[PDB]
Amino acid sequence: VLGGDECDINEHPFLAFLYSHGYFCGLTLINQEWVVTAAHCDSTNFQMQLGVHSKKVLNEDEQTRNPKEKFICPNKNMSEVLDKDIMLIKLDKPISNSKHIAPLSLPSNPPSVGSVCRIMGWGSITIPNETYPDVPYCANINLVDYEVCQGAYNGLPAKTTLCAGVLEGGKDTCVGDSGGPLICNGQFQGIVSYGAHSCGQGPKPGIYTNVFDYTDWIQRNIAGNTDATCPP
């Protein structure tokens, strides 16, 4: 993240951690059993770290889990990078709410453009470089036009995408923030997916998986409709 502050511990207990060779992707806890993230973030053999705050100091209660099950959109293009960039992860063992661990509630209404939302993660903190933080970082952005996504990125973003950024630039996600949350009013709204290098460019906002378009599919799976698919 760029143009922001180290994150407060009260605001990232939903953020999970994907590691095997090292660091792969951020994640979000939606409840004691289930974690969410981007399809693009699938690695073949990986694990979960819940409630990580500072590299320099491990708080009394990190939690390590494995992927019992995973799900991707059934109607998805297997090759095309960005279409339906979403994946659930059933943890092999349920997790409890403590200081450093707590779920994020799902969207009931979608975010009306021009709202002020919060991005976060362990990605690069800089415009050009790879400078990695010790605690996650936070920043306020706005939700913007679907034309300012299509004006910025000559490849058509999915009808199932959120567009956020700071019009004039200066606050954006970065290399390694993929699969992180975009939170608006206590509610989880978008999933970090792609943007541009360098981060923070004027009229070049970031692209997120429109969590609200798949909240039905999220729940369908969570109830047991393995057949169920996402809206094209």
The position carrying tokens 């090292």 is 22
Question: For residues 52 and 56, what is the distance between their CA atoms, to the nearest angstrom?
Answer: 11
Query: CATH topology of 1-12+104-212 equal to that of 13-103+213-232?
Result: yes
Q: Supply the DSSP string of the chain, one letter for each residue.
A: -BS-EEPPTTS-TTEEEEESSSEEEEEEE-SSSEEEE-GGG--SS-EEEES--BTTB--TT-EEE-EEEEEE-TT--SS-SSTT--EEEEESS----BTTB---BPPSSPPPTT-EEEEEESS--SSSS----SS-EEEEEEE--SHHHHTT-SS---TTEEEEE-TTS--B--TT-TT-EEEETTEEEEEEEE--SSTT-TT--EEEEEGGGGHHHHHHHHHT-SS-----
Pick the closest to residue 181 from 100, 132, 101, 122 (CA basis).
Answer: 122
The position carrying tokens 């903190």 is 125
Question: For residues 28 and 159, what is the distance between their CA atoms, to the nearest angstrom?
Answer: 22
Q: Report residue 79 as tokens.
A: 């090759």
Question: For residues 66 and 101, what is the distance between their CA atoms, to the nearest angstrom?
Answer: 16
Pick the closest to residue 1 from 204, 165, 209 (CA basis).
Answer: 165
Q: Are 118 and 182 in contact (CB under 8 A)?
A: yes
Tally the C-alpha atoms within 13 A of residue 124's C-alpha that lie toward its C-beta: 13
Q: Which residues are catalytic?
A: 40, 85, 178
Backbone phi, psi, residue 155, to 5°: -90, 130
Beta-bridged to residue 70, according to DSSP, are: 89
CA distances from 146 to 30, 156, 169 (A): 27, 10, 16
Which homologous superfamily is 1-12+104-212 in? Trypsin-like serine proteases (2.40.10.10)
- State the CATH architecture for 13-103+213-232: Beta Barrel (2.40)
- Which strands sit side by side in the sheet containing 34-37, from one edge to the other? 63-65, 47-50, 15-19, 23-29, 34-37, 87-91, 67-72
Tell me the domain boundaries of the chain.
1-12+104-212, 13-103+213-232
The position carrying tokens 């889990």 is 65
Q: Are 125 and 53 in contact (CB under 8 A)?
A: no
Q: What is the resolution of this structure in A?
A: 2.6
Buried b (16+ CB within 10 A) or exposed e, 15-45: bbbbeeeeebbbbbbbbebbbbbbbbbbeee
The position carrying tokens 């320099």 is 56
Question: For residues 149 and 172, what is the distance between their CA atoms, to the nearest angstrom?
Answer: 14
Q: Report residue 24 as tokens.
A: 């792969």
Pick the closest to residue 221 from 78, 90, 48, 91 (CA basis).
Answer: 90
Beta-bridged to residue 192, according to DSSP, are: 208
CA distances from 232 to 26, 75, 76, 102 (A): 25, 7, 8, 31
Q: Which amino acid is at 217?
A: W
